[PDB]
């Protein structure tokens, strides 16, 4: 049931890399402090997402065996997972405990950010669903690593090589679910289930951004590569 020394090593290594991300408080403090216009909010999103992608590439490069993979497959994994990892990180930030009334203001500020109503409902549905899972930081880190090392991504030439890298992370996550939540034996299945709902955010991500109540949708050259916009 317990983690082996090799698994404990893997977990702490993944945790240290995951911890290099912009702190959730640095994000919520800005949104909660002042109400910004839809124009200012689009620029905040774009800057946030550019920092997220940069840190995500550095996290991905540290994943055991990632640099042994074929160069084209490395690109396909990063490009295939960037949007999903972004929404998983936003779901983590959204569900962090804040003082009484702060989370309600946060949801209200995100609701009036400039995004269309059509996309608000499924976004908060996912955020609430992941929040009900009461995930630990280790679970978010491993789940992000599992999302990145998905062998079923399009344009992957060597799926087996990706499978070999994802399998020990899946084993570690399963053990943690059994340790953190022995009451809920469905917890691991629930986590893996939430990964299919993450995939739905891919199909209409570009439409989500273009529907923003702003005159000009300016993206950085890095976001254009990752989001297929402009």
């Amino acid at each position: 049931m317990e983690l082996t020394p090799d698994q404990q090593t893997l977990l702490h290594f993944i945790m240290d890399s995951y911890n290099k991300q912009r702190m959730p408080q640095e994000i919520t403090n800005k949104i909660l402090k002042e109400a910004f216009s839809a124009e200012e909010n689009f620029l905040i999103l774009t800057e946030m997402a550019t920092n997220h992608v940069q840190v995500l590439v550095e996290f991905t490069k540290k994943l055991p065996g990632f640099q042994t993979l074929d160069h084209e497959d490395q690109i396909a994994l990063l490009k295939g997972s960037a949007v999903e990892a972004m929404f998983l990180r936003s779901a983590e930030i959204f569900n962090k405990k804040l003082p009484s009334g702060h989370s309600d203001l946060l949801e209200a500020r995100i609701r009036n950010s400039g995004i269309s109503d059509e996309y608000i409902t499924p976004m908060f549905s996912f955020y609430k669903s992941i929040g009900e899972l009461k995930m630990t930081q280790e679970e978010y880190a491993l789940l992000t690593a599992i999302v990145i090392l998905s062998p079923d991504r399009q344009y992957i030439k060597d799926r087996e090589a990706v499978e070999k890298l994802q399998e020990p992370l899946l084993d570690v996550l399963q053990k943690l679910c059994k340790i953190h939540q022995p009451e809920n034996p469905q917890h691991f299945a629930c986590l893996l289930g939430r990964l299919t709902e993450l995939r739905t955010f891919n199909h209409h991500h570009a439409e989500m951004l273009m529907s923003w109540r702003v005159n000009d949708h300016k993206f950085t050259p890095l976001l254009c590569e990752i989001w297929d916009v402009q």
């Binding site: 590439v57 490069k61 690109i75 890095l222």
Partner: peptide, 11 residues
């Protein structure tokens, strides 16, 4: 097609 991504990966 993804030269910035390639660069960040090949740093």
């Amino acid at each position: 097609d993804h030269q910035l991504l390639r660069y960040l990966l090949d740093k």
